[PDB]
Design a protein around this ligand. Structure first.
Ligand code: MG
Ligand code: MG
Ligand code: MG
Ligand code: MG
Length: 216
């Protein structure tokens, strides 16, 4: 049974993290990634590795677009976030999708000030990026995966951060090759949300096998 098998995987995975040993958890799909992640966090709390209190925050996960998909209307859903790279300002301008209009193949975008504009799905090109805002729980000791540049940090997509402490007001993280812990915001809006996701389980797609597996 799955809940039984995942409980035992979590027990092995947590015991190895507690000992400071290298350990990796893989699964074959995003649903299993969420379920095994819940089982692993429960067990890391029971084994003393992750704090019991948790803080929820909005965070962003990339939705991949390329020349074949970028102009397909249903790739866009109300409440996703889009960013456009600004060549002057060297800055990503951020919006929320309020509306996707069929007939006219148009998005209505709203900015942090609450200003809107209509963009033709047509003018998008590779200067735009799409994200899903997700709410996620974070506790003291969390392992996070970086999914994009984080304001104020030198980290990149694919880096790992370890959460040293988290509260309603700030999350402090240990940054590989940075001396001091860095303080980051605890977001409750798509406009302040950081490009992070939980990092205990690997992203699926290029795994050793289809079965949920702990390498410990
Ligand atoms: Mg904050
Ligand atoms: Mg945050
Ligand atoms: Mg965030
Ligand atoms: Mg960020």
């Amino acid at each position: 049974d799955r809940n039984v098998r995942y409980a035992r995987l979590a027990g092995d995975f947590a015991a190895s993290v507690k000992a400071g040993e290298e350990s990796v958890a893989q699964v074959s799909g995003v649903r299993e990634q969420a379920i095994l992640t819940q089982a692993i966090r429960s067990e890391l709390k029971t084994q003393g590795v992750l704090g019991h209190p948790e803080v929820t925050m909005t965070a962003l996960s990339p939705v991949w677009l390329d020349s074949r998909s970028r102009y397909l209307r249903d790739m866009y859903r109300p409440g996703m976030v889009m960013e456009q790279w600004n060549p002057e300002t060297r800055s990503h301008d951020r919006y929320v999708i309020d509306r996707v209009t069929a007939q006219s193949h148009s998005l209505t975008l709203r900015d942090a000030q609450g200003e809107t504009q209509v963009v033709r799905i047509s003018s998008l090109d590779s200067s735009w990026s799409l994200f899903r805002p997700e709410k996620m729980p974070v506790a003291d000791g969390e392992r996070l995966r970086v999914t994009g540049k984080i304001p104020g940090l030198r980290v990149s997509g694919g880096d790992r951060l370890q959460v040293a402490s988290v509260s309603e007001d700030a999350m402090t993280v240990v940054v590989p090759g940075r001396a001091e812990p860095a303080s980051l915001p605890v977001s409750d809006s798509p406009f302040t949300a950081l490009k992070l996701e939980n990092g205990w389980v690997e992203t699926p797609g290029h795994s050793v096998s289809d079965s949920a597996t702990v390498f410990a």
